[PDB]
Design a protein around this nucleic acid. Structure first.
Lengths: 63, 66, 91
RNA sequence: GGAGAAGCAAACAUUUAUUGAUCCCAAGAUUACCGAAUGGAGUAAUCCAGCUAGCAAGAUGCUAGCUAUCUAUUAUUUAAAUAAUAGAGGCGAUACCAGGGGAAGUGAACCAUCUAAGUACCCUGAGGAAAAGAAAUCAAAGAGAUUCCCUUAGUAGUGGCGAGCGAAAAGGGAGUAGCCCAAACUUUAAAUGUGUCAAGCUGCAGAGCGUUGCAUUUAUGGGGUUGUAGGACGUUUAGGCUUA
RNA sequence: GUAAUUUAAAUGUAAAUAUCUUUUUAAAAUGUUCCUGAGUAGGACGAGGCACGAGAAACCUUGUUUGAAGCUGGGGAGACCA
RNA sequence: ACCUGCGAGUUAUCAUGUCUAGCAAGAUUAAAGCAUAGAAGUGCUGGAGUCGAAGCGAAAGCGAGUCUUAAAAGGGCGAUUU
RNA sequence: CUCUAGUCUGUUUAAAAAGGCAGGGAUGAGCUGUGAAUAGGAGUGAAAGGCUAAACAAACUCGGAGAUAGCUGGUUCUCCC
RNA sequence: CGUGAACCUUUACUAUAGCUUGGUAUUGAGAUUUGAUUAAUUAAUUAGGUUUCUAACUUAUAGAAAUAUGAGGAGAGUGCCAGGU
């Protein structure tokens, strides 16, 4: 399952990234807990546009 | 057409008809262990033969169309 | 029944066919069918819980592993819409 | 329709009918109780109610009218709960059709493959026909939706190659009819998310920094349906104007 | 009674005509982009239907798994390849 | 038990043989249509298909020859005398 | 009031399982009325291949079914070669 | 006697309920060394062995449900395939 991370993870990626994860990991943990969202149109595109325009950069994480 | 007589397929695959009645067939005993059989015996078994006139009526019953 | 509540999959009835002998594609003279019996192939339903943030609560549905896979692929709302069912029919 | 009528047969003594009866047809009324039976319950044809109206109504009084359930559509936080209409329950065809379940007696002179056979039967659905039906097809012929016949043909193949099972195409007929969504874009918004800049608009100018900024879902209209055509882009166009 | 004709107030079933309802209020016309149906096509295993019993066994449906392309495409032409 | 009634090689199609009728190297239409009639007819229309007219060889293929074979060299199955 | 060893009648009987004599139990593993539960490759059985609507080594009814039989029986007027 | 029928038994034949084993889906994240293979002890995969955390999943209580709490656990259970009985 390709998923888009609403936050950061140790081995996965940053908020806004998309990664392939095992389906159980995605469905039972990330999706219900809110750590990530399904990589669909009307969700992935909206999140990416909002992150690039309203967010536009790491919130002090890089520094 | 409701009741067309069915041919006997296992007989069709072994019998053949000549133009004026006789039945052609392939001789037996040339399918299997062959080293012991004499050469002239095998040569005669190769060539095809005709059945005795006593079976022709039954065969004509078995092959209603052919 | 053993029925996927989304797609409508149900168990499928068929035969039980034993075979004796060795297939020709393995050098054997062939195979022979034995005594066929009756049998059933069963869907593997799962009584899954989907947490829906949209109303902040979990809904339990009988779905097959195939439907679970498809939900993971497409998204639960879209899949329900495609099979013309609505989440409120559950609960 | 015209002279009898009081059923299916007359009898025995009573009336009606020329004031148009009886009877036939059409419509309407009446239409007890049980029964899908549905207020609850129940040993089917019957006891027990809730509420309203009238019986002096009243002490287990009588009569009339409502309160069963499922599904779809919304009046709401369609789940809970009632409310609103709409469509169903069952019977009938010891017929036909579709879907699901699916034998056994036999033949193979046994039997276990096979055959019988998708047969009987069971169950779920409706219809007057049903099913199917407008090629990601047949198939090496140039045809052109689906179905039903005549032929192909007991042929091609299949089968402990045993018994058996058994096409299709083409051709000749009956009968004829082709179409409509989604998606590609756009309008009207709502709901849910996210967003404070150059996000909308055919293109010059002024206004303009959020015509909700961009998306998804719901609802409405335009747009369109195929040997890859339909939209955004390319022009003549665009009846003609009002609106933008 | 029969032939050939012929009774319709009312009711039921049929067409046709307008009414009514709805739609087009336009088409012939070149190339760039967008879409053209997704757990679907296909493959592995287990079954069934095709006349066709795994047989070289296509193809279709289908249970358990896996899994695509996007016309610069895909399916079919009885294993398969061109 | 007697007596009287009832009480078993039929029908539908295919193969093959014979008889009858007709045509003849040809014979024959099936489904279906039209016309008249109302008279589940019978007069036409309809040649798609089948059986003969060439067989032999597993087949390709060749043909009064063909196959077995270097060989009509001898035979097997044909025919020239339907 | 419930049961049937032994014997007899009966056995084209009054009774498709009795009766005439007798015997066992008889305060209990008791008898019995009135309702209900267990249905066929199953039930039940203090256990005999018992019972389950007078028939049970797999109940009954309907349908498949006119099942299949190398078995038995039957197969109708006459004459000629 | 009939290539009759039924029942029963068995270390007769052939299937099969049920039982059992393995793999896979359900089924995730950790830690560790047992190795094999591929190249250059290192690196990329992969079967496992010993363990861990709970969010999947399932046990106890309350509740109509939702939900909560206390314990197990990616095991088990249930499908499919294969191996035994």
């Amino acid at each position: 399952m390709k998923v888009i991370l609403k936050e950061d993870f140790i081995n996965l990626g940053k908020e806004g990234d998309t990664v392939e994860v095992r389906d159980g990991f995605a469905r039972n943990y990330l999706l219900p807990k809110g750590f990530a969202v399904f990589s669909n149109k009307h969700n992935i595109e909206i999140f990416n546009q909002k992150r690039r325009s309203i967010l536009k950069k790491q919130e002090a994480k890089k520094q | 057409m409701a009741n067309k007589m069915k041919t006997r397929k296992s007989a069709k695959k072994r019998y053949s008809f000549t133009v004026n009645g006789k039945v052609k067939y392939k001789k037996q005993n040339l399918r299997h262990i062959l080293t012991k059989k004499s050469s002239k015996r095998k040569r005669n078994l190769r060539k095809s033969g005709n059945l005795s006139c006593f079976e022709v009526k039954r065969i004509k019953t078995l092959l209603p169309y052919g | 029944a053993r029925k996927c509540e989304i797609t409508g999959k149900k168990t499928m009835f068929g035969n039980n066919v034993p075979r004796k002998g060795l297939a020709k594609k393995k050098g054997g003279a062939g195979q022979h069918i034995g005594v066929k019996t009756k049998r059933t192939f069963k869907v593997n339903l799962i009584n899954k819980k989907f947490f829906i943030p949209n109303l902040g609560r979990s809904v339990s549905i009988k779905v097959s592993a195939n439907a679970l896979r498809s939900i993971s692929k497409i998204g639960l709302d879209a899949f329900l819409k495609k099979n013309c069912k609505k989440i409120e029919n559950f609960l």
